[PDB]
Amino acid sequence: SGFRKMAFPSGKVEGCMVQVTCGTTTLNGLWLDDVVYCPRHVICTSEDMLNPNYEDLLIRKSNHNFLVQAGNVQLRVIGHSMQNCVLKLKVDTANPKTPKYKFVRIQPGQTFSVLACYNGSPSGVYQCAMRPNFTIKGSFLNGSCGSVGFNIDYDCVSFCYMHHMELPTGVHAGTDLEGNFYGPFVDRQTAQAAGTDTTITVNVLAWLYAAVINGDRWFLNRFTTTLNDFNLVAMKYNYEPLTQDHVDILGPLSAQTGIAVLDMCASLKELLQNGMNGRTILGSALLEDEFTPFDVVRQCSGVTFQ
Amino acid sequence: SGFRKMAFPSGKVEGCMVQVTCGTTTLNGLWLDDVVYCPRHVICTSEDMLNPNYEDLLIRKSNHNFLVQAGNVQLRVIGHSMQNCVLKLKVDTANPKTPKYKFVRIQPGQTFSVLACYNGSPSGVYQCAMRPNFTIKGSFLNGSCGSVGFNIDYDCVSFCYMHHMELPTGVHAGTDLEGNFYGPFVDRQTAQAAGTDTTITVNVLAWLYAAVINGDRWFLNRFTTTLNDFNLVAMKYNYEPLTQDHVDILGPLSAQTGIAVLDMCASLKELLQNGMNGRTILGSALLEDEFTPFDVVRQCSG
Ligand SMILES: O=C1C[C@H](Oc2cc(Cl)cc(OCCNC(=O)c3cc(=O)[nH]c4ccccc34)c2)N1
Numbered sequence: 032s033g034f035r036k037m038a039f040p041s042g043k044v045e046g047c048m049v050q051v052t053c054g055t056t057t058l059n060g061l062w063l064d065d066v067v068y069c070p071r072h073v074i075c076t077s078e079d080m081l082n083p084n085y086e087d088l089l090i091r092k093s094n095h096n097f098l099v100q101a102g103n104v105q106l107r108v109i110g111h112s113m114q115n116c117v118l119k120l121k122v123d124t125a126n127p128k129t130p131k132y133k134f135v136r137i138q139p140g141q142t143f144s145v146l147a148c149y150n151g152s153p154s155g156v157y158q159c160a161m162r163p164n165f166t167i168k169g170s171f172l173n174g175s176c177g178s179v180g181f182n183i184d185y186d187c188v189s190f191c192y193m194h195h196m197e198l199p200t201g202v203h204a205g206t207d208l209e210g211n212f213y214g215p216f217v218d219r220q221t222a223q224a225a226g227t228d229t230t231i232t233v234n235v236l237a238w239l240y241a242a243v244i245n246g247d248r249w250f251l252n253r254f255t256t257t258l259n260d261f262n263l264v265a266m267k268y269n270y271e272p273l274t275q276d277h278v279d280i281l282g283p284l285s286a287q288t289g290i291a292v293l294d295m296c297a298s299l300k301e302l303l304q305n306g307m308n309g310r311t312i313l314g315s316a317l318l319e320d321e322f323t324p325f326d327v328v329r330q331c332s333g334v335t336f337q
Numbered sequence: 338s339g340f341r342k343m344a345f346p347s348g349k350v351e352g353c354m355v356q357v358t359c360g361t362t363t364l365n366g367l368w369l370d371d372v373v374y375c376p377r378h379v380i381c382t383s384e385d386m387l388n389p390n391y392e393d394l395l396i397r398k399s400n401h402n403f404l405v406q407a408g409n410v411q412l413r414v415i416g417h418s419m420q421n422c423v424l425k426l427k428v429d430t431a432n433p434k435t436p437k438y439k440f441v442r443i444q445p446g447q448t449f450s451v452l453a454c455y456n457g458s459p460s461g462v463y464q465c466a467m468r469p470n471f472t473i474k475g476s477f478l479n480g481s482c483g484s485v486g487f488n489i490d491y492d493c494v495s496f497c498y499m500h501h502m503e504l505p506t507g508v509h510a511g512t513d514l515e516g517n518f519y520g521p522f523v524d525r526q527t528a529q530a531a532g533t534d535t536t537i538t539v540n541v542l543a544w545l546y547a548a549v550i551n552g553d554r555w556f557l558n559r560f561t562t563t564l565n566d567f568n569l570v571a572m573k574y575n576y577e578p579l580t581q582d583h584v585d586i587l588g589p590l591s592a593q594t595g596i597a598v599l600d601m602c603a604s605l606k607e608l609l610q611n612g613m614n615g616r617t618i619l620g621s622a623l624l625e626d627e628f629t630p631f632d633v634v635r636q637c638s639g
């Protein structure tokens with residue numbers, strides 16, 4: 032029993048975190064095989080950041096301008112290149128702790144664990160979702176750039192996020208490990224704003240199933256809805272549209288609890304129109320949208336990652 | 338910026354998790370140096386769980402009755418002893434992944450990370466607080482016994498909890514790593530109930546300071562209160578009494594934000610009276626009590 036915001040065990044990723052210094056700037060790097068990946072903005076001064084020409088800034092750097100520290104050991108940079116917004120530093124040593132890994136680009140609504148790092152040292156792990164506006168509501172301070180997000184699928188780490196910046200509203204933006212930003216953001220010190228956010232509907236439904244699995248049933252009702260009627264109501268409350276793919280993905284949870292997806296949609300519609308009436312669901316007075324249907328199944332069934 | 342429920346990175350603890358089997362029972366063990374620690378109830382059968390005599394059950398076991406598996410390798414048990422409710426299995430190999438560690442007994446209101454495990458394999462990490470009724474609101478299934486709670490301030494792992502059981506209400510009970518239960522619980526299947534739970538007042542105040550540090554000020558007010566009048570109100574909402582130790586502990590956060598502790602107490606009194614009126618504080622519509630003053634400083638300042 033119980034339902035917590037749970038992150039993947041971070042050990043496989045911790046053994047990849049290094050510190051990258053270029054001049055006065057220090058941030059985190061991810062050391063996999065013989066390459067250290069980090070935000071390309073590590074090469075920028077504060078004035079360069081206003082309108083950077085990264086190709087021009089990079090051509091001026093030599094390998095010795097990058098100091099990479101793995102624990103108390105300095106790694107030797109023997110090459111450097113850029114791929115989109117990520118700098119790739121070739122080092123003379125393959126990381127002996129490199130886990131089985133892939134780089135994956137995730138979609139909004141997908142969740143991942145973030146290993147927040149400072150000076151190449153892991154400080155915390157938390158679970159978050161890629162918001163529909165492509166930001167993450169992370170928790171990051173100065174020096175956190177280069178911290179990564181990941182999932183574990185079987186024994187393979189899938190790296191999906193690298194931290195680059197914090198927007199004026201305190202939300203965060205970053206790239207996949209191929210250096211492509213999530214969202215309409217750029218790596219320049221300029222006024223940038225995230226679009227209006229929406230709630231991840233399929234995730235709220237998954238969390239309602241988690242509540243039912245844990246014995247929280249007060250919000251269940253006798254009613255059902257059509258997908259089209261539910262989507263009209265979802266648009267009204269700034270909820271993401273629920274697709275037939277989402278309905279199929281919730282199938283296993285629907286079969287386990289005996290509550291059809293459109294039956295749970297009718298519970299959600301009533302919750303939006305009327306509120307919780309002083310009640311809570313899984314210790315929350317708001318509808319939680321940072322658990323995917325896979326997260327719910329994984330947590331309610333005890334899947335492990337040795 | 339931002340404020341999240343954040344756990345410690347679990348790598349140091351993952352490299353210590355092993356599977357312990359005794360007869361038909363399998364659970365998790367913590368392998369540090371040449372000792373594997375686990376709940377002593379691993380030696381019980383289904384017939385023994387209401388009134389086990391652990392000394393009597395243990396004397397009947399040989400080293401070869403304990404199977405310890407670390408990854409795909411079997412460890413050799415060369416000794417066994419009990420310390421309170423924890424079984425200590427001496428093994429023939431020191432764990433090469435043993436981090437710098439200590440065993441600490443925590444007090445209610447304290448927070449820690451839990452590495453939930455099944456069959457000696459880590460499945461997830463989450464943040465918990467030791468409730469005032471000495472339970473934790475974890476997320477554990479069958480086979481989770483022996484999963485541990487810990488903190489990692491600096492490079493030293495402080496193990497503070499070992500999971501033993503789930504109570505009928507779905508909350509969890511366990512021991513420190515010296516085998517002493519937190520609370521009035523025993524490792525017997527007899528009906529046990531946790532006392533009425535209360536909100537950890539000092540932690541709610543710390544989280545209100547975290548909200549102010551992150552730019553949220555809507556809940557502040559021009560009032561202050563005496564400590565005694567605050568406690569008289571807070572108790573009516575099932576909040577733990579706020580002591581002068583708690584007021585002193587909040588001193589650094591009070592100095593950083595410019596909001597005196599009793600001034601923040603008056604904000605808390607108003608929130609308990611009015612609710613949030615459609616507003617949120619740090620993305621929550623309820624008052625959060627699983628962040629300590631130390632957690633807030635660590636997360637906000639680094
Ligand atoms: O709207 C916007 C943001 C963009 O400006 C940029 C662009 C780029 Cl590519 C990088 C950047 O800052 C990099 C250095 N940031 C940090 O260390 C940092 C990260 C964090 O998540 N939180 C912080 C909290 C306080 C202070 C520092 C941080 C800033 N324009």
Ligand SMILES: O=C1C[C@H](Oc2cc(Cl)cc(OCCNC(=O)c3cc(=O)[nH]c4ccccc34)c2)N1
Nearest residue numbers: 378477478479480502503504505524525526527529
């Ligand atoms: O009120 C109470 C509890 C005490 O009964 C005990 C005492 C002892 Cl020492 C052990 C025990 O169970 C050990 C085996 N528990 C589990 O695997 C288990 C742990 C968990 O946290 N959640 C579960 C969810 C479902 C099913 C199994 C679990 C039970 N009397």
Ligand SMILES: [Cl-]
Nearest residue numbers: 442443444447
């Ligand atoms: Cl403590």
